[PDB]
Amino acid sequence: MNKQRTLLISSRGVNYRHRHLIQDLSGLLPHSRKEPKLDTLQQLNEIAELYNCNNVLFFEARKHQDLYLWLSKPPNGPTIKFYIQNLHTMDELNFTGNCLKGSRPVLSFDQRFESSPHYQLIKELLVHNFGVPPNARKSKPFIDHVMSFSIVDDKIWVRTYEISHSTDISLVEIGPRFVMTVILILEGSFGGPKIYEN
Amino acid sequence: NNTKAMKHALERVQLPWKKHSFQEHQSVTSETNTDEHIKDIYDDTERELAFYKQSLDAVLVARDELKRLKVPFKRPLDYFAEMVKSDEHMDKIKGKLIEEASDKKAREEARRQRQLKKFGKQVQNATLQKRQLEKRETLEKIKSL
Amino acid sequence: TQNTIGNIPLSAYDEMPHIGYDINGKRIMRPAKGSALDQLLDSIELPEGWTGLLDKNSGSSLNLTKEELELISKIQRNEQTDDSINPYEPLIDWFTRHEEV
């Protein structure tokens, strides 16, 4: 039933840490397409159309310190800008991860997601944007890793954990972890009136 | 910030998850928990435990729901695929763990070999004295008859 | 894909009678249960489609079809690839039709 695709685009200036973050995100998401670069903003919707892609993720960066992320439905959907400050790359040896590439993810949303219409909107966006379709081309059958999302102090925290068993289950933190704020929401894809502003 | 705009956006974006099996959704909303019970988020320790509990609740919910369905949950370990972390990364992490274990062993040896060297003469003297005392006790017991 | 396995070496699954698990998680039983005579014949006189590397969906060599080999040969010696197109189309002078004033 559910079918979705994601487009990955990074502007010039993405440092090696952010590049590794994008690369491991593209590995966790099997329905993802990568593009070389972007220069200037509405052109992004055309790129998704060229691949019949239903979603697009743009990693903006004014300077090479602060990562920014845009999540939107290219055709006519709204877009949300995230001012990510904390960032941990997949290349950290503190986390041991044997997660299968592109396996089905399990989401975890707290009650704050339902506390406001825009919280529900971002929750749905994450659900369908990060939720791999069951019949995705590059997906995998078994479930081995889960995704955790918790929002406190007006910002959403992202965590990922691998599952484990014994001879009744246990999990260990894996993948990148960061904090994302809500900056601006637009009615249309990279355009339209500014509905919400912090 | 009128709620009408995002409400209309949801009207078009929201899918009929309730009308389809949970497998299509593959998302667990950990509602009933406001996440306000986290003790001193700034401590950097209780926040991790709170996130762990919130993720474990969703893990249990997903395990129950997928056990309701026929989709396998446990990985048989007989299926080999491209792990997210390459074998090189796993080898490097194992090497780091082995280095930590070697450091612990080195500390243990550093806290034992010096004492053994210091007490070596004392240990030898004590052993010799104990052996001589045992010999004398045996000889006296034999002569006691 | 049909196999769900990535770019991992095929050394694994040699002892098992299957090659990974396809979508939805069911065993892909190995169908390449050939005979020694067939293997020897395909070893001396290699099939025209022989390519060495094995297929992700089975242990049999991922032999290429003759049509693919024809296209490969055409590309490899500067032949035409997109057939049915005339390489000598007349120059339709679209701009010369108009005249300046």
DSSP string spanning chain C?
Answer: --S---S--TTTTSSSSEEEE-TTS-EEE------HHHHHHHHHS--TT--SSEETTEEEE-PPPHHHHHHHHHHHTT---STTS-TT-----TGGGS---
Question: Hey, are the CB atoms on B35 and A150 less than 8 Å from each other?
Answer: yes
Distances (CA, A) of C80 to A150, C66, C67, C90: 58, 17, 14, 18
Pair type for strands A169-180 and A87-88: antiparallel
Residue A134 forms contact with B (CB below 8 Å): yes
The 3-state DSSP class for residue A128 equals helix
Return the number of other C-beta atoms located less than 10 Å from residue A166's C-beta.
6
Q: Is B108 left (phi over 0), alpha (psi -120 to 50) or beta?
A: alpha
Backbone φ and ψ for B123, nearest 5 degrees, come out as: -65, -45
- Dig out the tokens for B46 from the structure: 């209780």
For chain C, first and last CA: distance in Å?
62
Give Cβ neighbours of residue A156 (< 8 Å, ≥ 6 apart): A122, A149, A150, A179, A180, A181, A182
Contact B26, A106 (CB under 8 A): yes
Check residue B27 and report its DSSP letter: E
- Dig out the tokens for B33 from the structure: 């928990």
Angstrom distance (rounded) from CA A16 to CA A89: 9
Of A137, A139, A141, the CB nearest to C21: A141
Give Cβ neighbours of residue A47 (< 8 Å, ≥ 6 apart): A7, A9, A35, A53, A56, A74
- Dig out the tokens for C61 from the structure: 């060599």
For chain B, first and last CA: distance in Å?
108
The 3-state DSSP class for residue A15 equals coil
Q: Which residue has the tokens 């994302």?
A: A180
Angle between helices B113-144 and B87-110 (to 10 degrees): 50
Angstrom distance (rounded) from CA C26 to CA C3: 10
Give Cβ neighbours of residue A101 (< 8 Å, ≥ 6 apart): A27, A28, A30, A140, B81, B82, B83, B84, C6
Question: Hey, are the CB atoms on B80 and C13 less than 8 Å from each other?
Answer: yes
CB pairs under 8 A between A and B: 174
Q: What is chain A's alpha carbon radius of gyration, rounded to the nearest angstrom? A: 16
Residue A139 forms contact with C (CB below 8 Å): yes
Q: How far is A2 from chain C (nearest CA, A)?
A: 15
Per the structure, the complete domain to which residue B42 belongs is given by 1-66
Angstrom distance (rounded) from CA A147 to CA A131: 10
Distances (CA, A) of B1 to A32, A117, B11, B143: 32, 11, 18, 107
Strand partners, A79: A72, A186
Contact C8, B82 (CB under 8 A): yes
Pair type for strands A32-34 and A6-10: parallel
Looking at chain A, which subunits does it touch, using at least 3 CB pairs closer than 8 Å as the criterion? B, C
Contact C19, C1 (CB under 8 A): no
On chain C, the residues whose CB falls within 8 A of the CB of A104 are none
Angstrom distance (rounded) from CA A163 to CA A168: 11
Could you tell me which residues of chain C have a Cβ less than 8 Å from any Cβ in chain A?
Answer: 1, 4, 6, 21-25
Give Cβ neighbours of residue C101 (< 8 Å, ≥ 6 apart): none
Q: What is the resolution of this structure in A?
A: 4.7
Return the number of other C-beta atoms located less than 10 Å from residue A129's C-beta.
20
Strand partners, A155: A152
Q: How far is B61 from chain C (nearest CA, A)?
A: 20
Contact B64, B73 (CB under 8 A): no
- Dig out the tokens for B38 from the structure: 């986290």
